[PDB]
């Protein structure tokens, strides 16, 4: 599943720090039952200092 590994996606999740921000997909989990399989890496950190977050494919579009 997922759009593609190594692709550029835009986050549609409202409560994330990287909403409407360009991110790079580093891992998509193909195991069933995982709610947020797509792991997206960002060039900028959030207030917690991390750049790695998991999103569903419904919360991302290819840009």
């Amino acid at each position: 599943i997922g759009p593609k590994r190594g692709s550029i996606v835009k986050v549609l999740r409202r409560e994330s720090y990287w909403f409407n921000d360009t991110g790079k997909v580093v891992a998509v989990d193909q195991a069933p039952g995982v709610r947020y399989p797509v792991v997206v890496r960002f060039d900028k950190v959030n207030y917690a200092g991390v750049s790695t977050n998991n999103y569903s494919p419904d919360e991302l579009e290819q840009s």
Partner: protein, 160 residues
């Protein structure tokens, strides 16, 4: 204009010139006439007399306090109080705003974009600080071409 006499014919403005030299002349009375601190007060008096003869020759408006007041409405007599040095300012302030904006675009497409802001790339900086000379033609040029503003779909927006 606005009930203010011109400073060249203001009796209060000439009173402040009289009582400023008299304050400095009484400071000069306790020094030798060829001494080094007396040359500073003598240069202060000539700086004061240059100042009062410059304010009256520019068509400044003086109130009842004997002080030069600025008319910032955009009067044809009063352009050098606000309009002329405001356009001089905004050109310089837009120069600061255009070469800082163009530096961030030039370092966002780099390998480590955050190390180029603590350590400012001077050959990259100085090649666009010259380019900030013609910035109204480049800001409205980027405004007309759409490169000045970013679309709201690519802008980080806090949720409702």
């Amino acid at each position: 204009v606005a009930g203010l006499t011109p400073c060249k014919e203001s009796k209060g403005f000439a009173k402040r010139q009289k009582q400023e030299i008299k304050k400095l002349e009484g400071r000069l009375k306790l020094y030798a006439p060829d001494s080094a601190p007396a040359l500073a007060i003598n240069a202060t008096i000539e700086k004061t007399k240059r100042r009062f003869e410059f304010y009256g020759n520019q068509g400044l408006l003086c109130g009842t306090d004997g002080l030069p007041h600025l008319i910032v409405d955009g009067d044809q007599a009063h352009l050098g109080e606000f309009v002329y040095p405001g356009l001089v300012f905004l050109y310089i302030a837009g120069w600061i705003g255009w070469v800082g904006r163009a530096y961030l675009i030039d370092v966002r497409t780099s390998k480590k974009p955050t190390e180029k802001e603590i350590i400012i790339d001077v050959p990259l900086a100085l090649r666009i600080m010259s380019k900030g000379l013609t910035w109204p033609v480049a800001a409205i040029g980027e405004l007309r071409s759409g490169k000045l503003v970013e679309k709201s779909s690519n802008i980080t927006v806090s949720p409702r």
